[PDB]
Design a binder for this molecule. Structure first.
Ligand SMILES: [Co+2]
Length: 54
């Protein structure tokens, strides 16, 4: 699946890994993350992520 980078801290949201420590199962698309999910490292909102693709 796709990977997204936090433009603040460099955390990679890997859709294949999800974010289970914060309620997100592996395989959850970025678009499907709750609106108020934040970067688990720096706390940045979803707005600050960019998808890693051309
Ligand atoms: Co971050």
């Amino acid at each position: 699946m796709a990977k997204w980078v936090c433009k603040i801290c460099g955390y990679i949201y890997d859709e294949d890994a999800g974010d289970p420590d914060n309620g997100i199962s592996p395989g959850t698309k970025f678009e499907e993350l709750p609106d108020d999910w934040v970067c688990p490292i720096c706390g940045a909102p979803k707005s600050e992520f960019e998808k890693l693709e051309d």
